[PDB]
């Protein structure tokens, strides 16, 4: 029933001003970006600064801020020693 976080089209500069007054870190708003059709941005008050993040999209039109992909098998395996191979189960890799 209406999202307080959607501020439509507004200049970066207006959200900075409107966020630096929000006291609690993690205060945020999404905003249609002002130069790229359908682009979105997420602005976050954090610390004494106000931060911005491009809202990425994939060829399927999924949205995501950041994802993790590796350059090689070595790195892929190295990562999953501390984070789940699966997503529904927590299975970590341990060398035999």
UniProtKB/Swiss-Prot annotation:
Effect of residue 54 to R: Loss of polyubiquitination
Covalent cross-link Glycyl lysine isopeptide (Lys-Gly) (interchain with G-Cter in ubiquitin) as placed by the record, residue numbers: 54
Residues carrying N6-acetyllysine: 54
Compartments where found: Nucleus; Cytoplasm; Endosome; Golgi apparatus
Sections of the chain in a coiled coil: none
Ranges of residues in domain SH2: 5-96
Annotated function: Non-enzymatic adapter protein that plays a pivotal role in precisely regulated signaling cascades from cell surface receptors to cellular responses, including signaling transduction and gene expression. Thus, participates in many biological processes including regulation of innate and adaptive immunity, autophagy, DNA repair or necroptosis. Controls signaling complexes at the T-cell antigen receptor to facilitate the activation, differentiation, and function of T-cells.
Quaternary structure note: Homodimer. Associates (via SH2 domain) with activated EGF and PDGF receptors (tyrosine phosphorylated). Interacts with PDGFRA (tyrosine phosphorylated); the interaction may be indirect. Also associates to other cellular Tyr-phosphorylated proteins such as SIT1, IRS1, IRS2, IRS4, SHC and LNK; probably via the concerted action of both its SH2 and SH3 domains. It also seems to interact with RAS in the signaling pathway leading to DNA synthesis. Interacts with SOS1. Forms a complex with MUC1 and SOS1, through interaction of the SH3 domains with SOS1 and the SH2 domain with phosphorylated MUC1. (Microbial infection) Interacts (via SH3 domain) with hepatitis E virus/HEV ORF3 protein.
Note on domains (UniProt): The SH3 domains mediate interaction with RALGPS1 and SHB.
Similarity section: Belongs to the GRB2/sem-5/DRK family.
Protein name, as recorded: Growth factor receptor-bound protein 2
Name of the gene this protein is made from: GRB2
Full-protein positions shown: 60 to 151 of 217
